[PDB]
Amino acid sequence: QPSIGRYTGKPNPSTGKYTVSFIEGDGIGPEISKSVKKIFSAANVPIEWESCDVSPIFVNGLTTIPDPAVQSITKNLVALKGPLATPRSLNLTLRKTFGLFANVRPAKSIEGFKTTYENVDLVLIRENTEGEYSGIEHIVCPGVVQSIKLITRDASERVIRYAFEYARAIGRPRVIVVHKSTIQRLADGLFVNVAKELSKEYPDLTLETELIDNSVLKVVTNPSAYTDAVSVCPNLYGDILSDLNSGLSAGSLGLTPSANIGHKISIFEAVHGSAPDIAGQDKANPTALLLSSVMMLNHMGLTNHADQIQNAVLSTIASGPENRTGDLAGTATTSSFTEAVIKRL
């Protein structure tokens, strides 16, 4: 496990159980969180929850995160949030308060589930601090919008460090830095240079650089060619590339886990929406939130429980059409799914 955003262990002195903030969110949030707890109890894992509320409080018009949740999460060092609907930016303040600088986005095919692309196993780490997130827009002359975007060596030498340590930590040879024409944008020149500087501190790893143009041409014609690699990119192309990857693996954000790594805190979440018009009806698909659990486990050190709840479980239960869910042309229900998983747990 990566030295960069290392988990400071310490189970509960009394219970022998690790404390983990929740944030069940809304829409299909509740019923998906319920399924995670029933599979975490049923597999007997060293974890006691602590549901937080992150409803956007306003302080000086600047969106701030409630102190109840801040204290909870700063203490536990880990959180596992579900979806939440849309009112600054909820997700943007979340990353700013907890110092989350890296976003980890896996995209893997499900064995035994026929999707249009096959044998995809992609990992993409994107920067979260700067770029278009800390961007400024203004009107210069009457019909003219100017954008101002920032990139720094510090923030870059950090996702890139993490990318290296993460490739090592999952046993992958190459880290690929994706960028746009290096000579016509010295912003990508800075990102690439930083990556070459760190190349030497990681001799077990091969550093490749690729034009984002070529990357998308290759990955789409043959996704497997990147299952031995970990890609990093600047904040700019991160949104686009990660969503393209999930389109290769599944055809939607439905089955996609994500990790937001900070220097000490780390939040794990599915990236699909609240989907309110399917709430209560027990049709939700907890696979996404489940797989973020796995990533969370693995970040805590509970490797045995991680593989247990991932290896068999939902991965293998997503085989056989009477399971699945409405989204994956299945017939099962969020309840029937949870225990169908506890079956081969």
Residue ranges that bind a second copy, judged by CB under 8 A: 140-141, 144, 146
From the list 13-21, 213-221, 286-294, 321-329, the region that binds another protein by CB under 8 A is: 213-221
Angle at 87 between CA 81 and CA 89, to 5 degrees: 65
Which part of the chain contacts another protein (CB under 8 A), choosing from 97-105, 174-182, 196-204, 336-344? 174-182
The number of beta carbons lying within 10 Å of the beta carbon of residue 123 is 22
The torsion region of residue 22 among left (phi > 0), alpha (psi -120 to 50) and beta comes to alpha
Binding marks (x or -) toward another protein, 233..272, rule CB under 8 A? Answer: ----x-xxxxxx-xxx--xxx-------------------
Q: Which is nearer to another protein, 205 or 233 (CB)?
A: 233
Piece of the chain touching another protein by CB under 8 A; list 140-148, 307-315, 319-327, 330-338: 140-148
User: What is the per-residue DSSP string for 180-197?
Assistant: S-TTT-HHHHHHHHHHHH
What's the closest the beta carbon of residue 146 comes to a second copy, in angstroms? Answer: 7
- How far lies 205's CA from each of 6, 29, 90, 202, 298, in Å? 20, 39, 36, 6, 21
Name the token pair of 21. Answer: 């903030």
Close Cβ partners of 249 (under 8 Å, ≥ 6 residues apart): 107, 108, 109, 115, 117, 120, 122, 223, 255, 256
79 binds, among another protein, a second copy, none (CB under 5 to 8 A by kind): none
Stretch that binds another protein, among 62-70, 179-187, 285-293, 298-306 (CB under 8 A): 179-187
Spatial CB neighbours of 122, under 8 Å, sequence gap ≥ 6: 106, 107, 108, 219, 223, 226, 227, 231, 245, 248, 249
Q: Report how far Cα 326 is from the mean position of its chain's Cα atoms.
A: 24
Q: How far is the CB of 152 from another protein (least distance, A)?
A: 5
Contact 216, 109 (CB under 8 A): no
95 labelled ligand-binding: yes
Measured at the alpha carbon of residue 231, what is the angle toward residues 316 and 202, in degrees to the nearest 5? 110
Among residues 64, 97, 182, 206, which is the contact residue for another protein, using CB under 8 A?
182
* Maximal CA-CA distance, the chain: 65
174 annotated ligand-binding residue: no
282 a known binding residue? no
Q: Which is nearer to another protein, 133 or 162 (CB)?
A: 133
Residue 71 interacts with, from a second copy, another protein, none (CB under 5-8 Å by kind):
none
- 3 state SS of 250: coil
Residue 239, annotated as binding a ligand: yes
Q: Does the footprint of another protein cover residue 185 (CB under 8 A)?
A: yes
Of positions 17, 75, 88, 153, contacts another protein by CB under 8 A: 153
- 190 touching another protein, by CB under 8 A: yes
Question: Does 49 engage in binding with another protein (CB under 8 A)?
Answer: no
154 is known to lie in a ligand binding site: no
Cα gap 88→91, rounded to integer Å: 9
- Taking CB under 8 A as the criterion, the residue among 68, 213, 263, 329 binding another protein is 213
Q: Which one of another protein, a second copy, none interacts with residue 342, CB within 5 to 8 A by kind?
A: none
Min. distance of Cβ 229 from a second copy in angstroms? Answer: 37
221 contacts another protein (rule: CB under 8 A): yes
CB atoms within 10 A of CB 193: 15
Residues belonging to the binding site for substrate are 95, 105, 126, 213
Residues belonging to the binding site for Mg(2+) are 213, 239, 243
> Where along the sequence are the contacts to another protein (CB under 8 A)?
116-117, 132-141, 143-154, 180-187, 190, 211-214, 216-218, 220-221, 237, 239-244, 246-248, 251-253
